[PDB]
Each structure stands twice: as structure tokens, then as C-alpha cells.
Amino acid sequence: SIVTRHGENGIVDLVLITETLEGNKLVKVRVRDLRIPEIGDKFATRHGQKGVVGILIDQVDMPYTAKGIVPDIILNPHALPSRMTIGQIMEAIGGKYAALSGKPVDATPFLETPKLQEMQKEILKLGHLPDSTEVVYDGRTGQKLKSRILFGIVYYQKLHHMVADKMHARARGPVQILTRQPTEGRAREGGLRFGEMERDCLIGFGTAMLIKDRLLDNSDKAVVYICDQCGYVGWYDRSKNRYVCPVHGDKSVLHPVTVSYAFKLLIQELMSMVISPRLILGEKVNLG
Amino acid sequence: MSEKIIRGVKFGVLSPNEIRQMSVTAIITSEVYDEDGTPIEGGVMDPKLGVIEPGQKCPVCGNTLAGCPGHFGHIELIKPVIHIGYVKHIYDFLRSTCWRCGRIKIKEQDLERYKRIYNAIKLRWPSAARRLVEYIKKISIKNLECPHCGEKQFKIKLEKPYNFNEERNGSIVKLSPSEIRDRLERIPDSDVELLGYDPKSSRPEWMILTVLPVPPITIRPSITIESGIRAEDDL
């Protein structure tokens, strides 16, 4: 049966039933869900100014101007002088002029009409400052800011990189059938890869127990029994009671060792070839 | 009994007798299953090798998946075959020893001096030992006669990947694994360790396959994905 994907819900939008040219029944179910902007959503402009929403501010806390207009989006000035996008400010001024005048604005390259000077003069004629700046009061304290702030009507776009589709966390769950390690994929309950470079960072900090916790205790830990003479892996059967060796039978003593299961798999598949790896044991407790 | 730790790993070449004695069953039949009867005796899916579905007990050991390590099988090859990964080594075992008496074609006294030096410097200066053994191999390959048995030796050229064609005064003869194994069985232990090998753990004729190990199911599990027939793996 077809089930809804894990970690996402919605409302069934459409159900369609038809036939696929041979009498076979074909059923399609379309499910919709509502996405409201939040912290982490990505927005962009027509000048290369992507970024995520850092916080959402109400109308009362926004810095209103002398006419009561509050911004819809606030953009940091420090992003302008390095990227050198003068077209951003030019579009802001042009959009404010277009909204004030109701006249069309054409921004085709090399043939822009009207020019900036005409637009600024018309903006001044319509009750606003020519440089597109405004007197702004603080919405939280009511104190007038000592400087004037630039306002515009830049056009924004919302991209399909929403935070609601990017979270994935795993505590415990299914493991691989072969390596007995956590699975992969957001829909498969998750699992994050701990690569070599993170291991190098941990070594550089010199934290041995943290390395053991990250790489052994939380993935493919196992206990295996090794014969004391041949060095191969034995087992411990439930017939009555026995430590049994594949070659020595019952004439050898077996010891248990904790080890990554991937290492045991490596040993087993090395014995699949003609290589014979014999494990030499040692005392857990250091005498002296 | 005490809980221990892994202190070292000793490698080597797995002996055919050791393969025979570590195995639990001998694979005789050639059909993987009959009427979906995977427990068919003598097949690759024999239950004695291991268990992978949740509810089952291994015939060899009364344990489930939680405590059942895989069990190995053995296949008795009727015609010897050569290991593709070891060919280079046996190549150096063919051009540096006599075909008849199975001895290095370097005279006695200097060979004894060389082995004394090698044993005296083997562990302290591994790079020097490697240089010494490579020099010995080079000066033994370039000899066309065996001082020990007084016989004239021909030369062997390697052809990829695994076929050796020796020249015997014309009419190049293709070599068979059986005679190669017979030739390599005659090399003494004192002379095989001089070339940088271990006689007690890596014997050259064990490098020629007569018995093949069969990995357990736990290494090659059957996948029943796509909600259809189970899809076996390549092994």
C-alpha cells in the first residue's frame, strides 16, 4: 500500500482514477500543504542578494517613519559596498517613484527611461525627499533617529529552499543488514556520516574517550570470541554451554573482545580470499 | 577466563588443509534452491553456513542473528587454479629458482653468507633487508644455470593476466597450474625465507588453489527489496 512520506503531512487535494490503455486501473492522489514564511526561509532579489530570514518583527516594533510606513524587509548596508550592486539602490528609487507617480518605469540596459535626476525631481514634487531617504522613529521607544534612512520598493522572490524540508535528526532506529550500521536518508529515519576530517579534528583536540564514543559506542559495536591458539573467531552456542572454536572444537579457551562490527566483517571477507588474519590477544589490565 | 583486547594481527596464506578443517560442510550440488527450498543440502544457501532471517536457529550453533557468526564452507577443486592477486609473487618464485631440484641457482657459500647477513639484519634494518633480497633476486634471475644440480635453466616471460609461457629452445610451451604447484612445492624453507617470505605462515604452494573457501550467508545476504522476488547478490 502507498503511504504518506515520513515527516510531512497535508490535506488530500485531488483523487483521479483512470485506465492505462490496457484496462489496468491507475490511481493518482495529490496532497497539498501550506507553507508560511519563517526563520530559515530563503529570499533573493534580481541582483544577487540571497539570504535567510534571521527574525520576524511585528509592526509595533518596526521603525516607522513620519507617515506611518514600516519596512517590509530590512537589508544591512554592509552588504552593499563589497558586492558593488548599485542597481539595487537604483531599483529601490525607481520603484518608489513608480508607486508614487503611477507612471511606467523602464530599466532596460543602456536605454533607461526616465533618468535618475528626473525621477528624483518628480519624487520631490510628490511630497518625499529626493534622495529617497526618510525620517524614522524607533518603534520600541519612540525616539527619533539622528539620521535619515533609505526606503525603496525593491522586488523580491522566494526560493524553494525552505527549512521545513531540511531538518532531520536521529536518535536510534534501523540498521544495515550487512554492516549493522545506521541507515541513510531523511525518509529512512536519518543518520549522519562522521567522516575522516571530523576524526582528525577530534584527534587534534586529543580527546580519546570522545573519539571512542563517537565512532564505536554509537555505531556497529559488537562482541566477538577469539580462540587463544589459532586466532580465529569462535562462538557460544545454546546447546548446553560451550565456548567453541571452528578448528580447535572444545580443546581451546576463548576470550571475548569488543570491536567494531565492520572490522569483523572485514576479517570475514578477508578469509573469503586466501588471506588468513590471526588476531593476537592481550591483557585488558596493564600490570604496572 | 578473562576479557582481553586485540594486540596484533598476524597475516599469511590460508592452508588448504586449514580450509578443509575449518569448514563445516562440503558444497557438492549446483542448484541454489528447489521449489523455494533454500535449506537444500549441499547448496550455497545451506542453513549450516548461517542464518539471516529474524526467526530461525542456526543448525551449527543454537543461536539467532544476535550471536551467530558466519560459518565457512569448502569446495574441493579437481584441477588446481592460480590466485590472480598472488601471480607476481609466484612469478618471482619461477625465475629465481631451479625447475628440477627446486633450489636457488646461486652457489652455496655466498648464499649461506647472504642468509646469515639477512637473519642478522632482518628486523633492525627492514629497508636494508629489502634491498638485500632484491639484489639477491636480481643476481639469481640473471643466471641461466643451476650450480646445485648442474642443469641448464631456460627463461620464463610473464603474459597478462595469469598465463606463463616458457621458452624451451623454440615452440613456446604454455604452463599448467599443476606443474607450477609441483615446482613450487620443492623449494626448501631455508631458501624461501631468504627471498623475504615466511615458510611457516606463507608457503608458496599454498599460493596455488586446490580448495576454495565458501563465505557464509551473513557476508552475502539475500535482499528481498522491491516487494517481489528476493534478489541475490553477485557473490
Binding site: E283, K284, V285, L287 | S2, E3
Partner: peptide, 7 residues
Amino acid sequence: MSYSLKT
């Protein structure tokens, strides 16, 4: 837990 007992 180990002993390493000897006589």
C-alpha cells in the same frame, strides 16, 4: 574485570 593470577 581481570585477575592475571599466577602460582
